[PDB]
Amino acid sequence: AAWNYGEVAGPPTWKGVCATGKRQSPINIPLNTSAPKVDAEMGEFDFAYGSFEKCDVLNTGHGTMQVNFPAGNLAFIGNMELELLQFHFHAPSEHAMDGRRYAMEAHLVHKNKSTGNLAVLGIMLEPGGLIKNPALSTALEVAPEVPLAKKPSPKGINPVMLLPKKSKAGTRPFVHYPGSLTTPPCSEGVDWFVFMQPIKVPDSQILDFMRFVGDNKTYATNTRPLQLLNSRLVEYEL
Amino acid sequence: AWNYGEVAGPPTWKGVCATGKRQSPINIPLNTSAPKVDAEMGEFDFAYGSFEKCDVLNTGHGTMQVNFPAGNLAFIGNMELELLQFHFHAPSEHAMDGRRYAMEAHLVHKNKSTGNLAVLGIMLEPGGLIKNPALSTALEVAPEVPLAKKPSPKGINPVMLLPKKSKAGTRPFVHYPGSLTTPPCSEGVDWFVFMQPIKVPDSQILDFMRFVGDNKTYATNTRPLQLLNSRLVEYEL
Ligand SMILES: CC(=O)Nc1nnc(S(N)(=O)=O)s1
Ligand SMILES: CC(=O)Nc1nnc(S(N)(=O)=O)s1
Ligand SMILES: O=P([O-])(O)O
Ligand SMILES: O=P([O-])(O)O
Ligand SMILES: O=P([O-])(O)O
Numbered sequence: 001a002a003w004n005y006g007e008v009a010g011p012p013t014w015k016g017v018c019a020t021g022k023r024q025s026p027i028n029i030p031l032n033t034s035a036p037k038v039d040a041e042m043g044e045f046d047f048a049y050g051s052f053e054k055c056d057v058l059n060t061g062h063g064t065m066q067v068n069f070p071a072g073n074l075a076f077i078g079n080m081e082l083e084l085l086q087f088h089f090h091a092p093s094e095h096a097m098d099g100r101r102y103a104m105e106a107h108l109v110h111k112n113k114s115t116g117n118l119a120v121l122g123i124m125l126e127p128g129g130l131i132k133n134p135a136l137s138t139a140l141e142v143a144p145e146v147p148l149a150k151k152p153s154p155k156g157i158n159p160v161m162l163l164p165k166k167s168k169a170g171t172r173p174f175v176h177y178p179g180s181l182t183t184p185p186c187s188e189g190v191d192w193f194v195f196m197q198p199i200k201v202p203d204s205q206i207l208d209f210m211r212f213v214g215d216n217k218t219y220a221t222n223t224r225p226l227q228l229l230n231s232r233l234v235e236y237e238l
Numbered sequence: 239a240w241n242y243g244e245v246a247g248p249p250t251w252k253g254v255c256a257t258g259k260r261q262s263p264i265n266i267p268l269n270t271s272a273p274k275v276d277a278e279m280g281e282f283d284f285a286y287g288s289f290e291k292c293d294v295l296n297t298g299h300g301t302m303q304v305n306f307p308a309g310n311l312a313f314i315g316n317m318e319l320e321l322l323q324f325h326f327h328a329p330s331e332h333a334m335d336g337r338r339y340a341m342e343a344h345l346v347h348k349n350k351s352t353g354n355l356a357v358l359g360i361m362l363e364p365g366g367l368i369k370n371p372a373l374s375t376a377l378e379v380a381p382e383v384p385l386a387k388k389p390s391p392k393g394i395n396p397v398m399l400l401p402k403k404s405k406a407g408t409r410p411f412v413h414y415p416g417s418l419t420t421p422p423c424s425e426g427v428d429w430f431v432f433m434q435p436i437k438v439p440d441s442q443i444l445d446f447m448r449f450v451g452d453n454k455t456y457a458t459n460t461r462p463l464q465l466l467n468s469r470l471v472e473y474e475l
């Protein structure tokens with residue numbers, strides 16, 4: 001006969017824009033493509049994440065924990081101003097780079113003060129890290145095991161720590177594209193910025209997270225399959 | 239109200255897979271308020287070679303599969319089990335008081351007394367500071383092409399996939415009648431599950447999850463827990 005373990009059963013049954021939209025996330029992000037690449041001409045991100053003491057850690061009942069920030073944490077790119085709302089994680093990564101996913105993907109979700117949209121910053125987490133990632137760590141420690149339950153972090157959580165390090169040219173290369181939320185209702189009009197430089201992380205933390213995703217009784221994943229690019233193009237700021 | 243869910247594959251599996259009342263894996267109650275019936279079976283005695291020349295196969299269903307020659311014998315309850323092959327599942331397929339471990343190793347045997355299959359399950363825990371060399375070689379030698387096999391250059395010591403003897407010289411375990419955990423999910427299999435996990439490095443658990451994801455993602459290859467039904471788990475603690 002013919003059989004597999006297959007993928008998680010839920011995502012191909014999500015309704016509304018999840019099924020109908022044509023600007024859905026995530027997507028494959030070509031790198032080693034011969035195909036020529038539209039430059040984003042947006043310049044480089046600058047971060048003003050200061051108001052990061054006093055955080056809530058929330059158990060979404062959807063695998064990941066969610067760190068909620070108070071107003072005042074700002075990032076700038078192009079002329080646009082981005083106010084940080086929350087961050088969370090996916091394992092394995094949601095976006096892919098030439099077909100290949102990573103151990104985790106961090107999602108920093110912002111209100112886009114300039115467009116009225118949301119903007120999601122996306123960072124790849126790789127295994128190999130010698131230092132625990134402090135933001136990830138605290139998110140792991142504080143996160144209520146009871147689902148739906150949220151409780152305030154006693155430690156401060158610096159979300160800049162989820163950003164890749166600057167290159168040997170001042171930059172943090174990224175791709176930009178219009179897409180959606182990767183969970184229901186998958187609303188569109190989200191600006192996606194996926195950085196190309198992964199951050200290394202001790203394997204303990206990746207297993208700790210997949211453990212959290214598995215209700216602390218197994219190891220599990222919380223990722224959506226890749227979606228068609230369709231009419232879009234991806235903008236590179238390499 | 240929406241979710242990611244469990245993998246979509248196993249609930250569709252047909253045959254005995256879907257109809258059997260004696261299926262694996264199951265939950266192994268330890269700290270329960272129910273009486274534990276002792277298996278009274280004695281302890282395992284292992285005579286496994288230390289540097290076996292093995293074929294490593296890519297099952298094309300997640301795990302690689304290490305095949306052995308004859309000579310690797312496990313003795314229990316006055317029976318002779320011979321090792322056919324090992325492979326892995328991530329997370330563990332058995333649970334223990336509801337909880338699964340990072341991986342489970344399955345050492346499959348032919349009961350030479352009976353001719354029926356027996357499987358030994360060992361939990362693999364993260365935390366380990368020492369690379370387990372059997373899992374290591376199995377990851378290294380595993381052919382990339384599905385259903386292909388390649389002989390290993392290095393010997394494999396399958397005893398490395400078994401837990402150390404305790405302070406009292408035991409390797410406590412549980413015994414129950416079950417099935418293959420993959421189609422045809424044939425029943426009549428004797429399951430022995432060791433209570434003591436082995437620590438392996440987090441690197442290797444991830445390597446394995448990577449293999450299951452065919453080097454492009456991180457996946458699992460575990461069947462969901464089954465109902466004990468009318469069955470009894472017997473204990474050798
Ligand atoms: C209010 C809000 O931020 N909702 C989100 N839903 N999904 C997100 S994701 N995984 O696509 O970044 S963010
Ligand atoms: C021939 C044979 O042994 N087939 C098996 N299929 N699944 C196995 S498991 N995971 O239940 O040990 S063994
Ligand atoms: O090889 P590592 O990146 O899993 O330590
Ligand atoms: O050879 P063993 O069964 O004592 O390890
Ligand atoms: O069978 P033994 O020699 O390991 O006790």
Ligand SMILES: O=P([O-])(O)O
Pocket residue numbers: 203204207364365366440
């Ligand atoms: O190193 P640990 O935290 O995975 O046991």
Ligand SMILES: [Zn+2]
Pocket residue numbers: 088089090107182
């Ligand atoms: Zn997300």
Ligand SMILES: [Zn+2]
Pocket residue numbers: 325326327344419
């Ligand atoms: Zn198995």
